[PDB]
Design a protein around this nucleic acid. Sequence first.
RNA 1: ACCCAAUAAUUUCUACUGUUGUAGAUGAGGGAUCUCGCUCC
Length: 1156
Amino acid sequence: METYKVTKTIRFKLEAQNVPEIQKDIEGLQSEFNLANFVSDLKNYLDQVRNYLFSEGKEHVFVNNKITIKREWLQNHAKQEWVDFLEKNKRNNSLNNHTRRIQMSIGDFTGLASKIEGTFDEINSICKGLADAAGAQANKRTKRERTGLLLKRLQARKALPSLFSLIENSADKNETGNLSLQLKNKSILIEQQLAAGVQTFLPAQSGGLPVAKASFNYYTINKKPVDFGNEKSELESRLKISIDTIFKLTRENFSKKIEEAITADIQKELNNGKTLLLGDVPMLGIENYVSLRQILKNIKSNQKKAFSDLMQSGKNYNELKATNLYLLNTIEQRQFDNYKVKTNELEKLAVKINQATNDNQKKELISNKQRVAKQRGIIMRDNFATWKSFSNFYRTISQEHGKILALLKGIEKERTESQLLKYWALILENNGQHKLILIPREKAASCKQWIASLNPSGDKLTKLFWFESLTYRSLQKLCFGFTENGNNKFNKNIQNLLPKDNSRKIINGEFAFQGDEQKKIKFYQSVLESKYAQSVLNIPIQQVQADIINQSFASLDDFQIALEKICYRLFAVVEANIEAELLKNDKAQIFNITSSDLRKEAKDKIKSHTQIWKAFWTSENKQNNFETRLNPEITITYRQPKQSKIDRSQKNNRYLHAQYTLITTISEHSNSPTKILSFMSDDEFKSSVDTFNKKFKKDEIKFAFGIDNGEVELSTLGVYFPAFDKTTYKEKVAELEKVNDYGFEVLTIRNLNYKETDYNGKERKIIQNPSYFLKKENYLRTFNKSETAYQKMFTEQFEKKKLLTLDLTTAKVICGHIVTNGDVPALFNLWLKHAQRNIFEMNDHIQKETAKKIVLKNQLDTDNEKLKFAEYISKEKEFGKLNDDEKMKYTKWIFEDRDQNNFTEVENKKFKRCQKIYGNYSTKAKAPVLFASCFIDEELQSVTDIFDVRHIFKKREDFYALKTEEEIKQLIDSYNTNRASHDISNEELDLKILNTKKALVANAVGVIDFLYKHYERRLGGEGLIIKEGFGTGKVEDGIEKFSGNIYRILERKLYQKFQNYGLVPPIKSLMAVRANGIENNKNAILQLGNVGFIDPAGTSQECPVCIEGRLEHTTTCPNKCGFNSERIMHSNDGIASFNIAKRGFNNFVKSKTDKQ
RNA sequence: ACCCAAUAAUUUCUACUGUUGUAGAUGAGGGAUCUCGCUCC
């Protein structure tokens, strides 16, 4: 198996040596903000938008179908939808001319409306949250944090930005006023104020904030500035219009009366200093200027509506002549008669449709109605000469506006772009460490000229570095970059090379090639061959001449790949006093690259990240065409000190001072790129993924791991072997008993409460951090004891085991060892903060003073609450089918001991489909339960349950050595009764939760990785990883909305990890998976590389041997099959993983029945 | 002098914790048979 090409983000700490310049920007980034004003403006804006999108009709409030959308928006937010649309059109061959005047609208896209409505509702909810926050009376810091978080959430690339995009890229055919312009204008102010707010309230994000950008490639930086404002004004001047000249721009010879009517209508706005302009300029925030386009639109719409209303009323011809609809009152009485006849036909068809009794007949009537409507529209569009002329005129006008607009948009874009790339980048090496050097934009020419004159590389401890790289996209941006403005010097030079029209006109844009790969290939070949080009670009001419130029390719992909592959070079020079000279002459900025590790000579180990960076500079990596590559662009961020506590010194740490931070991108195994999968048509997806899987073979799978499914704390892991598949129960059980063979080593802490004292007189607890104990060196250094004492302590404290299964909850890796009980504090913290979160949520509701009364009863103790708990744990859809007696039986089943009632097989089967997950609630794990129904001391009747029931917490079996039993009850109870004294916001608690979850997954990842490696090495083959239930595809609603959903997190993380080894298909995000085929098929399997999924069939507690038996409370199977769990598995709860693995493997085998 | 009993060596988290610190984990779903326009539902 061979690795892919992979890209990882990387960070570093920066220390300032001399930063006089760069600092200026930071100074200039200061802004002002006002909370209340922002909230009010956002509320008003959101109020207005609804009138834009949503159409009338209380029966169904929904987004107008007929709304039009540009391709642009879709490509940034609706990838999948777009793709689907394309395929739909393409496949169907609804394109009998291979290029067309295409148009599209919302109603033309499947499911888009639901998406847009959801986004709008989410934004409204966030706005309400901000309003409440503003009106809040919390403590100062609390408030500040809350606000910050809210802003953060609001500002994400799933939010307001999206809406703005939508707005900016949409239009209405039937607008009557001028709302769209107002929304367009207000968008910019909202954006700027959001920016300001972010700036203000969030100066202490872990990543800091962007301040400047730099790149290594000389291509981009050398861009000289352009006086955009003057060109802006020049362009703007073209919109000036004289009222008399409006009709002189078209060939339509409108009647004098009609033209006078239009003039009067336009003159209606000739007042109050209003200035008439051809179009509209949002970019300049124009207001109090009237756009002719909009006026014509309005006139069109209004007269159309009036005419339709008149026909719907069946008024006479003479009455039409008396109307003011000058655009339509000029038609013939014959045309009016034909139109009225068609309208009467439509009325009859509608009456019949209302009289329709069958779907097919109604469909036929609707088709006839559509045909008649098309006939009416054809007649209207053909016969109405005045309408025609109006339309023509309108069209004439329209185009011009856009013309100018596009140019303006481009200019703006360009300006925005150029405002970023301030500095050219260089790296200096000295005494085994690296300094970062930035050169100002304006000195780049002299800097480049000077460097080229220096001597070549020399064997000395001082050196300088500078890159040069070429990529397909880079080249394309060079070639066709903003050619419209004529600012692209490069594009000028190459002009003679381009293809020509029939007219001999040079077509200065990519569309000239009409999608022919064979043409694009040849063109870039030529380009490269171009003498001019070679002057600006430094490239391996010798190699490329044969490898690129003088070659042919099957598809664009190969060319792309090749180009990307070869074009990468690195240079160095040496000279005395370079550091001084650069700062002296070119205003050079200097940074010191530093790390916690980089400083230390203890090369014992280093963080993962660090290894990459060090490996890059090694001599060997140079020979292999830089198997590790560094991207050409970088970012700089700044972070303010968070200091908000009273004085007494505390200690030195990060966050106590301002810090500069570096951002880069690095790649691995670049020599072997591959087409990265993304959102695609299902067919392509399936074909690709299946092709990848065939790389394996049936007989290469030596082993498999099962990951179980359960509640919030995660659950057990175990292995399976082919050999286990014996013929008889006796042989099976005998085989299984060979644990000594097939097993793996683990460690257990004998005593959680062990402790010792250091030379400092400070206590150390084993359960706080095993590391300080296990590791010989650490122990020695900390406690100065002898090696013999070390050995004695180790053998006394620690116990060894060999097992097939593991409790993954507490599992942790330490110094090449597996520890079952290694990490308690993490798990304790998770359960405690989950409990507080839910108690907070419950007390948040029932804000009205009647019977608030949470009771924390630790027991159900009453009916009508059991039912509600059952309701809470079960699926609605399945739950609805049960009768009250069935419900009761359900409850009993849930709560009652397994042997109390002889549940029928049908009852069991139906039950099993109800619950989300299984677990004991009476006798094993003693989880405390909440309800709030208690007005008065409880009674079987009354005491309405609608105040809800909730699953709070769990007692771990050791309690903990942490804290004390009495105090945990107190802590949890306190959290209900004493809300006020706890100074934490809901909106932040979620965040704090998330991380904890996030962190804890790490341990799991590590353990699985370790075991995988181990087994692989031992056996010399690849293994299968099986997980119960495909989760990522779900809704994730409610509490979960911002809580993580632990299994989802694991799902993604695990996948990510494996990606390195190249054992899974190159999927960029898991969301793309077409997981529909899994549901309800015990024999089914979904395969992704070596990773797979199976349905949750509820096989738990199923005997591994005899299948029939049930394992509840005894290590020995009650079915007398000879099976015993004592010697094999840590606990009976390991059993679920084993079954999972078995089943999965079996399925895997079966799938290749008709393929291998 | 007990309640706003909280915080705490890191590129950054999580446990811990003070001057050779220790354990595990760790990236970013944005690109050209164009662009911008007009009927009718």
